[PDB]
Amino acid sequence: RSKADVERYIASVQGSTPSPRQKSMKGFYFAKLYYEAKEYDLAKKYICTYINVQERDPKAHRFLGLLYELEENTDKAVECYRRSVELNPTQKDLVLKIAELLCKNDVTDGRAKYWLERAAKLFPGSPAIYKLKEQLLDCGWNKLFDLIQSELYVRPDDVHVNIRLVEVYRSTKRLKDAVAHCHEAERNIALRSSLEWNSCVVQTLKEYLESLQCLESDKSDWRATNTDLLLAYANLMLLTLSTRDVQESRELLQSFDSALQSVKSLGGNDELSATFLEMKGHFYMHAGSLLLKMGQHSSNVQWRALSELAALCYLIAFQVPRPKIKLIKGEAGQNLLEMMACDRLSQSGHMLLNLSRGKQDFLKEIVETFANKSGQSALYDALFSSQSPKDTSFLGSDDIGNIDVREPELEDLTRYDVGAIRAHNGSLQHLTWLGLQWNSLPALPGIRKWLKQLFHHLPHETSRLETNAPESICILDLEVFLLGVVYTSHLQLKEKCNSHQPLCLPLPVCKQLCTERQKSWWDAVCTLIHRKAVPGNVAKLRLLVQHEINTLRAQEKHGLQPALLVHWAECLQKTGSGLNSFYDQREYMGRSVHYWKKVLPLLKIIKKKNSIPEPIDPLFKHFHSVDIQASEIVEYEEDAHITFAILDAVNGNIEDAVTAFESIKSVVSYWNLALIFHRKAEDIENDALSPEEQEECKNYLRKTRDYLIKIIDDSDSNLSVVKKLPVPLESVKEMLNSVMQE
Amino acid sequence: YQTERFTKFSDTLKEFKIEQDPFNIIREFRSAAGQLALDLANSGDESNVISSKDWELEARFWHLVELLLVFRNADLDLDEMELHPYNSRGLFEKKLMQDNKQLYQIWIVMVWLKENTYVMERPKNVPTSKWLNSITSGGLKSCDLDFPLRENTNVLDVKDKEEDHIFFKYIYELILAGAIDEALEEAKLSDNISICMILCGIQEYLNPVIDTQIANEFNTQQGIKKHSLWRRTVYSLSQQAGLDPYERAIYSYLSGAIPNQEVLQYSDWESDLHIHLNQILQTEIENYLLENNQVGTDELILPLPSHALTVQEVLNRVASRHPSESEHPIRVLMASVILDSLPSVIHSSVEMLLDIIDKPYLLRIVTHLAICLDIINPGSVEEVDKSKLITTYISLLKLQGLYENIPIYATFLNESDCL
Amino acid sequence: KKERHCRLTSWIVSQIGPEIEEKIRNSSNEIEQIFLYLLLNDVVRASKLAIESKNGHLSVLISYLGSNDPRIRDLAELQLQKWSTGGCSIDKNISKIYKLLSGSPFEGLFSLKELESEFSWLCLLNLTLCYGQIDEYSLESLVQSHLDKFSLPYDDPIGVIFQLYAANE
């Protein structure tokens, strides 16, 4: 548009509605286009005339206030917002604005204070609220300090406020207190995950090292503060790699390597030495992740060479032993250090594998070719510019001795993951990554154990299942949730690459793998459970969780594709069928039967080749990639009937369970048939009782033996059956040994 | 063993003559042929893949026969539908399909055609979400299907187009197979909500409350009132290039039109015939609606052809478009059944015994068909023709050394005396 | 109910007619025009302009406006949430049109409520009445639904009549 387009429309509606009232009632819609044509002295008079006839419109009044804001006329802009706010109270964002503008222009009047109080209760403890609290105070040093401290009491997890405390300490040049709080705050799990906080941590420490106060004071605690710098570097590196661009991440590596080189000389056998050990591993791991980031964008020749280089890095990291935990002063410190160790082994572990699955014993070649010191120079070359002095760089001086070149064992990997769930504050990013990394492996992850490590004493299943109130959240709900998040995530990435490996991406490099909806839910239920919510936001968080519960439980209007339900059903059956206790068996089998009972009606319609009613804004994205086909229907009906029988057996309907189990000659039905025949024998096997009954009791133990043998006979013959076993093969053989010795 | 075949067919005849409904005979013939189709197909000499397809074809023939003769013959005439002008288009469509048997037959045939249509396996590794590549590259200022249409297709990433191709092709195969529910499921689940929505326009409007005579099938209004519009809207969309050829193909099929050359070039006798019967059908409905003032003038946005072909002519054209396939002897019977000129062709291939002897299935099939026909419709095939047919087939039962089961076939003449 | 609804909505279109036609006169963007045609409850010319301006898919989607197909409703809303959670950028008027397909154009989370300042209250009420969820609601409780979202000027009498109509009980 131009000046002609808008001023010519004057004659357009002037010739359609010529009376003064309708001429002025079009002022807002006249002014609507002058704001777009960069006319603010003109747009002002157009809207102001519509306000002369439509004086009760909150939109028009705000629009003039927003226009007076561009004019920087605070007194006029504020008044306009006031009118729109008093007309319509639901305009929260305007209550902030008024409070925001009143504190910036002049604080002498209490009106600025009043509007700030309201702004606080509309946005409980938002980042802007404190900003305004500091602004109002600005219009003395001790005064500011008390605000931050009183603010930190109730908001200790606020990144910005804690940063300001370090800045206030630094302004009074009492850096020892700055690092002291910086050290006591590196125990906070939330702050450790904040990119901006860790950046502040790196500076305030370095400043203290060079500070005159560090030398004069003493050289005893010098080592203590030095440890935190390395820790900060590791956290900062993890975060910078994910969010920041290629250039910034590489630059952080040089500071990390400089610190490592400056630290190794002291050595010793204390926390600092142990910290250097674990951080050393992180360096290569992140360096490997850093390497893979560059190659992804680059060509194929560089990719293989870089991935080759990265594989060595991850390998170096994985080899590094578990740090000496006992050697730390406190329980918090040592637990932290171990947590990071698990994270290192887990992340590097999966990467090492995903890179080694590409070829046969691909790992062996990597070591045999690049473990040579020539690789050390090829690594420094690709990562850094050769101009920097290669003497004080830790990378160039490390003694790469006897690389284990042994691929990781799954069992070890599981306990690394489980121990590192709390590494990144259980971000759904973290878990959705792990869940995907295990999606390609033959052994499945202990999700139920992950959740127990996060939400302690959260019941497996809530008694009050009738309602969806989120006080009834259960580890099953979460377990059911993560399954969909990963099943959804995998399909989304599968679709992406098809248009354009998905497993090979390292955790920092990849972007959000879940929908912001899913992430919002997890963050909500997490903040709620851990009791780090906000009294004001409690009701909102609570409802946000409540919204999705009815889907995790397949209730009214669940956005669940039939394939995802089936996946939930079987994934819970086999998860539960391998559990030892009855409580857990019952619960997981119950939910599995539940989801089954919801699918079968859909499968029957799908069985006759009809259409499923597609969802409305589903929580778990539908995909035709995994849409159920008639070829697989009869199998699910069968696999479901097993899940029914299993629950019947656990409840007590043995007669119907056996009748069903025997109907289908499946490997799993044997283990169930055997397991329940053994129980009927063992209890009655040795007490004084009718001899005829004793013979019938022994007869069952004879059936147990036979079914276990059928399992092993069919198992050893075919591999596909080995994977169908509801429990491990060695566990089946273990029972048989005891069964026959009975 | 397979040189059992004749038994199976013979076997079915035994069971029929002995429980003294005849449509079961044919149903069994179908299953029999299908079973045999499986045998020659599984593990076989690559000389068998040919006669395997001639059995699958056999089977489809028996099915088509069942469907059509069931509808035509089990015709016991029901109650006429009395519409009002206030009634929805949905009801008028239904009325049309009730009253006009000629046209319902076209429906029956299309149903059969769909039944036997091949569909690719569901695409694997489908991506999390739509046009993700373009979004990630930056440059989608709008995330709506029509954005790269508003301005150069250069907007969409290559990989995104490649995936849209995978999708639209799969949806198209599903549509040709009658799998509309699966198509909607795929659309929903693959983050193609807008395309899904497009697929929802397929239904004519009904309101259970107004259109009383279907207040059983429905509890809620459904379908779309301004359908002639919808239809032009879709057709026009179909003609707009810069869309994937399969997407355009889809909209073509939905508008009762004939898909673009890039897609149509790969359609076979069945596929092509299907396409053109769909056209006949669509045109005929919309004309039915115009003759009853149930179309509103505003909706006639665009010209669509109004002149319906006859099944005769569609067949002739599709034939000349697929001569090899057309000429295949069971597919000739397929057409013969479709046009009802069936005893017509029986007597014909009868006189070809007076290059039918060269292909083995034929002489059998014609004979058993003739038998079925005169069972279901006494009088159907000329007495003589039955005599000639059974005579010749019997002499092959002899050449195969299966004299055992000759009496069964005898049960149709006093000429049997002479055996 | 259908008859009454159709007459009311034809009438509202009679009133808002020139307002909107003026607005279409001054638009410089095709998708916005398509939206305005929906403001005059003219589904067909929206569909046609879409077609012409090469917006074909939208065009198809448009054809649903005024059938109250709940499938389409929940699908449109879904698309909107997906955009309003990442969705790097979606055209300002396509989202408006999807919001119309959602059946709850102010009642919502991508809300047309801000159009309060650009259009006659009657114009927006037309939107609720035409799209809005016709079948599920009585004319009265539908109108009431709309009024619950927007204060009308005290002095305006056609406003008053709608309020008395909706007030029923």
Side-chain angles (χ1 to χ4, degrees), chain B residues 104-122:
Chain B
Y104 193 68
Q105 242 148 119
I106 289 191
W107 180 246
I108 296 279
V109 167
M110 290 175 60
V111 166
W112 167 79
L113 273 164
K114 291 172 193 152
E115 193 114 27
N116 309 313
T117 292
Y118 173 90
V119 180
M120 63 193 273
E121 75 183 19
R122 206 176 308 87

mmCIF file of all heavy atoms in Angstrom, chain B residues 104-122:
data_model
loop_
_atom_site.group_PDB
_atom_site.id
_atom_site.type_symbol
_atom_site.label_atom_id
_atom_site.label_comp_id
_atom_site.label_asym_id
_atom_site.label_seq_id
_atom_site.Cartn_x
_atom_site.Cartn_y
_atom_site.Cartn_z
ATOM 1 N N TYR B 104 -27.399 -48.531 -10.309
ATOM 2 C CA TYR B 104 -26.952 -49.355 -9.201
ATOM 3 C C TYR B 104 -26.036 -50.484 -9.676
ATOM 4 O O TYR B 104 -25.057 -50.788 -9.016
ATOM 5 C CB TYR B 104 -28.133 -49.933 -8.426
ATOM 6 C CG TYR B 104 -27.685 -50.515 -7.109
ATOM 7 C CD1 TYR B 104 -27.220 -49.683 -6.100
ATOM 8 C CD2 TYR B 104 -27.685 -51.881 -6.884
ATOM 9 C CE1 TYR B 104 -26.793 -50.187 -4.894
ATOM 10 C CE2 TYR B 104 -27.259 -52.401 -5.671
ATOM 11 C CZ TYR B 104 -26.812 -51.546 -4.682
ATOM 12 O OH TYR B 104 -26.385 -52.045 -3.472
ATOM 13 N N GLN B 105 -26.382 -51.141 -10.784
ATOM 14 C CA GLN B 105 -25.486 -52.139 -11.375
ATOM 15 C C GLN B 105 -24.073 -51.602 -11.584
ATOM 16 O O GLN B 105 -23.082 -52.300 -11.333
ATOM 17 C CB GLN B 105 -26.032 -52.660 -12.708
ATOM 18 C CG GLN B 105 -26.339 -54.157 -12.691
ATOM 19 C CD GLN B 105 -27.497 -54.553 -13.587
ATOM 20 O OE1 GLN B 105 -27.332 -55.341 -14.520
ATOM 21 N NE2 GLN B 105 -28.677 -54.008 -13.310
ATOM 22 N N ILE B 106 -23.991 -50.338 -11.991
ATOM 23 C CA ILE B 106 -22.711 -49.686 -12.201
ATOM 24 C C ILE B 106 -22.023 -49.615 -10.860
ATOM 25 O O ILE B 106 -20.828 -49.909 -10.752
ATOM 26 C CB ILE B 106 -22.868 -48.268 -12.780
ATOM 27 C CG1 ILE B 106 -23.327 -48.316 -14.231
ATOM 28 C CG2 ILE B 106 -21.583 -47.467 -12.605
ATOM 29 C CD1 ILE B 106 -23.248 -46.983 -14.924
ATOM 30 N N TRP B 107 -22.779 -49.217 -9.840
ATOM 31 C CA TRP B 107 -22.236 -49.226 -8.481
ATOM 32 C C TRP B 107 -21.664 -50.596 -8.096
ATOM 33 O O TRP B 107 -20.512 -50.681 -7.687
ATOM 34 C CB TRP B 107 -23.297 -48.788 -7.472
ATOM 35 C CG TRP B 107 -22.793 -48.767 -6.064
ATOM 36 C CD1 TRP B 107 -23.202 -49.564 -5.033
ATOM 37 C CD2 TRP B 107 -21.745 -47.940 -5.542
ATOM 38 N NE1 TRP B 107 -22.496 -49.263 -3.893
ATOM 39 C CE2 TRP B 107 -21.592 -48.272 -4.182
ATOM 40 C CE3 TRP B 107 -20.929 -46.943 -6.091
ATOM 41 C CZ2 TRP B 107 -20.656 -47.644 -3.360
ATOM 42 C CZ3 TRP B 107 -20.001 -46.321 -5.274
ATOM 43 C CH2 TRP B 107 -19.873 -46.672 -3.926
ATOM 44 N N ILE B 108 -22.477 -51.648 -8.211
ATOM 45 C CA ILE B 108 -22.064 -53.030 -7.932
ATOM 46 C C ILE B 108 -20.723 -53.349 -8.584
ATOM 47 O O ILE B 108 -19.808 -53.897 -7.949
ATOM 48 C CB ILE B 108 -23.120 -54.053 -8.408
ATOM 49 C CG1 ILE B 108 -24.426 -53.872 -7.625
ATOM 50 C CG2 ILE B 108 -22.609 -55.474 -8.219
ATOM 51 C CD1 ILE B 108 -24.413 -54.525 -6.252
ATOM 52 N N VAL B 109 -20.602 -52.957 -9.848
ATOM 53 C CA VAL B 109 -19.424 -53.287 -10.634
ATOM 54 C C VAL B 109 -18.224 -52.521 -10.105
ATOM 55 O O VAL B 109 -17.149 -53.083 -9.953
ATOM 56 C CB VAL B 109 -19.633 -52.970 -12.124
ATOM 57 C CG1 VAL B 109 -18.310 -53.026 -12.875
ATOM 58 C CG2 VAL B 109 -20.634 -53.942 -12.728
ATOM 59 N N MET B 110 -18.407 -51.233 -9.834
ATOM 60 C CA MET B 110 -17.344 -50.432 -9.241
ATOM 61 C C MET B 110 -16.874 -51.017 -7.909
ATOM 62 O O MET B 110 -15.679 -51.059 -7.636
ATOM 63 C CB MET B 110 -17.802 -48.991 -9.055
ATOM 64 C CG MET B 110 -17.975 -48.229 -10.352
ATOM 65 S SD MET B 110 -18.654 -46.595 -10.038
ATOM 66 C CE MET B 110 -17.386 -45.917 -8.970
ATOM 67 N N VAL B 111 -17.822 -51.465 -7.088
ATOM 68 C CA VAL B 111 -17.521 -52.120 -5.816
ATOM 69 C C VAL B 111 -16.622 -53.329 -6.046
ATOM 70 O O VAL B 111 -15.596 -53.500 -5.371
ATOM 71 C CB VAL B 111 -18.809 -52.571 -5.083
ATOM 72 C CG1 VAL B 111 -18.478 -53.539 -3.950
ATOM 73 C CG2 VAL B 111 -19.578 -51.366 -4.554
ATOM 74 N N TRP B 112 -17.004 -54.160 -7.013
ATOM 75 C CA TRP B 112 -16.191 -55.317 -7.380
ATOM 76 C C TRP B 112 -14.794 -54.874 -7.830
ATOM 77 O O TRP B 112 -13.794 -55.490 -7.463
ATOM 78 C CB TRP B 112 -16.897 -56.134 -8.466
ATOM 79 C CG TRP B 112 -16.043 -57.162 -9.142
ATOM 80 C CD1 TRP B 112 -15.700 -58.396 -8.662
ATOM 81 C CD2 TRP B 112 -15.460 -57.063 -10.445
ATOM 82 N NE1 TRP B 112 -14.921 -59.059 -9.579
ATOM 83 C CE2 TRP B 112 -14.760 -58.264 -10.683
ATOM 84 C CE3 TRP B 112 -15.454 -56.073 -11.432
ATOM 85 C CZ2 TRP B 112 -14.061 -58.499 -11.866
ATOM 86 C CZ3 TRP B 112 -14.759 -56.307 -12.604
ATOM 87 C CH2 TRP B 112 -14.072 -57.511 -12.812
ATOM 88 N N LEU B 113 -14.738 -53.817 -8.637
ATOM 89 C CA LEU B 113 -13.484 -53.299 -9.176
ATOM 90 C C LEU B 113 -12.556 -52.886 -8.043
ATOM 91 O O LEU B 113 -11.352 -53.138 -8.085
ATOM 92 C CB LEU B 113 -13.741 -52.118 -10.114
ATOM 93 C CG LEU B 113 -14.019 -52.503 -11.568
ATOM 94 C CD1 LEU B 113 -14.627 -51.339 -12.331
ATOM 95 C CD2 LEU B 113 -12.745 -52.985 -12.242
ATOM 96 N N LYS B 114 -13.137 -52.258 -7.024
ATOM 97 C CA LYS B 114 -12.369 -51.718 -5.912
ATOM 98 C C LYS B 114 -11.821 -52.899 -5.137
ATOM 99 O O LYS B 114 -10.626 -52.959 -4.843
ATOM 100 C CB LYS B 114 -13.230 -50.837 -5.003
ATOM 101 C CG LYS B 114 -13.687 -49.519 -5.613
ATOM 102 C CD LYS B 114 -14.694 -48.822 -4.702
ATOM 103 C CE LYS B 114 -15.401 -47.676 -5.410
ATOM 104 N NZ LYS B 114 -16.757 -47.427 -4.849
ATOM 105 N N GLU B 115 -12.730 -53.806 -4.777
ATOM 106 C CA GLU B 115 -12.412 -55.056 -4.084
ATOM 107 C C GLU B 115 -11.065 -55.635 -4.539
ATOM 108 O O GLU B 115 -10.251 -56.060 -3.720
ATOM 109 C CB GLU B 115 -13.530 -56.085 -4.282
ATOM 110 C CG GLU B 115 -13.430 -57.278 -3.337
ATOM 111 C CD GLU B 115 -14.593 -57.339 -2.359
ATOM 112 O OE1 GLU B 115 -15.678 -56.821 -2.697
ATOM 113 O OE2 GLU B 115 -14.413 -57.864 -1.239
ATOM 114 N N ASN B 116 -10.847 -55.647 -5.853
ATOM 115 C CA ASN B 116 -9.690 -56.311 -6.442
ATOM 116 C C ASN B 116 -8.586 -55.344 -6.878
ATOM 117 O O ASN B 116 -7.858 -55.617 -7.831
ATOM 118 C CB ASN B 116 -10.127 -57.137 -7.658
ATOM 119 C CG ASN B 116 -11.292 -58.054 -7.352
ATOM 120 O OD1 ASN B 116 -11.299 -58.755 -6.339
ATOM 121 N ND2 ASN B 116 -12.289 -58.054 -8.230
ATOM 122 N N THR B 117 -8.460 -54.222 -6.176
ATOM 123 C CA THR B 117 -7.457 -53.222 -6.533
ATOM 124 C C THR B 117 -6.225 -53.381 -5.639
ATOM 125 O O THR B 117 -6.353 -53.632 -4.441
ATOM 126 C CB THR B 117 -8.028 -51.791 -6.413
ATOM 127 O OG1 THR B 117 -9.029 -51.590 -7.419
ATOM 128 C CG2 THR B 117 -6.929 -50.742 -6.567
ATOM 129 N N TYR B 118 -5.035 -53.245 -6.219
ATOM 130 C CA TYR B 118 -3.806 -53.357 -5.438
ATOM 131 C C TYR B 118 -3.505 -52.047 -4.720
ATOM 132 O O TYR B 118 -3.653 -50.965 -5.290
ATOM 133 C CB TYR B 118 -2.640 -53.760 -6.353
ATOM 134 C CG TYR B 118 -1.272 -53.754 -5.701
ATOM 135 C CD1 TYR B 118 -0.771 -54.892 -5.080
ATOM 136 C CD2 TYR B 118 -0.467 -52.621 -5.740
ATOM 137 C CE1 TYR B 118 0.484 -54.893 -4.497
ATOM 138 C CE2 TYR B 118 0.786 -52.614 -5.159
ATOM 139 C CZ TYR B 118 1.258 -53.752 -4.540
ATOM 140 O OH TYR B 118 2.503 -53.746 -3.957
ATOM 141 N N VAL B 119 -3.087 -52.151 -3.462
ATOM 142 C CA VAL B 119 -2.592 -51.004 -2.710
ATOM 143 C C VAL B 119 -1.213 -51.242 -2.106
ATOM 144 O O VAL B 119 -0.948 -52.314 -1.555
ATOM 145 C CB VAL B 119 -3.557 -50.615 -1.570
ATOM 146 C CG1 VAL B 119 -3.032 -49.411 -0.802
ATOM 147 C CG2 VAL B 119 -4.931 -50.334 -2.122
ATOM 148 N N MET B 120 -0.330 -50.255 -2.235
ATOM 149 C CA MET B 120 1.037 -50.388 -1.749
ATOM 150 C C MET B 120 1.005 -50.580 -0.231
ATOM 151 O O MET B 120 0.005 -50.273 0.415
ATOM 152 C CB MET B 120 1.871 -49.153 -2.131
ATOM 153 C CG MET B 120 1.378 -47.837 -1.517
ATOM 154 S SD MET B 120 2.106 -46.347 -2.242
ATOM 155 C CE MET B 120 3.592 -46.181 -1.255
ATOM 156 N N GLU B 121 2.102 -51.051 0.347
ATOM 157 C CA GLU B 121 2.180 -51.187 1.797
ATOM 158 C C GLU B 121 2.318 -49.803 2.416
ATOM 159 O O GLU B 121 2.863 -48.899 1.778
ATOM 160 C CB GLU B 121 3.344 -52.090 2.207
ATOM 161 C CG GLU B 121 4.720 -51.455 2.091
ATOM 162 C CD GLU B 121 5.820 -52.435 2.432
ATOM 163 O OE1 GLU B 121 5.549 -53.653 2.395
ATOM 164 O OE2 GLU B 121 6.950 -51.996 2.731
ATOM 165 N N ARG B 122 1.791 -49.619 3.628
ATOM 166 C CA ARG B 122 1.782 -48.302 4.264
ATOM 167 C C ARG B 122 3.199 -47.755 4.330
ATOM 168 O O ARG B 122 4.121 -48.483 4.703
ATOM 169 C CB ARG B 122 1.206 -48.356 5.686
ATOM 170 C CG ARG B 122 0.581 -47.036 6.158
ATOM 171 C CD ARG B 122 -0.100 -47.076 7.544
ATOM 172 N NE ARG B 122 -1.074 -48.152 7.730
ATOM 173 C CZ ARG B 122 -0.773 -49.380 8.144
ATOM 174 N NH1 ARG B 122 0.478 -49.693 8.457
ATOM 175 N NH2 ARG B 122 -1.732 -50.280 8.292
#
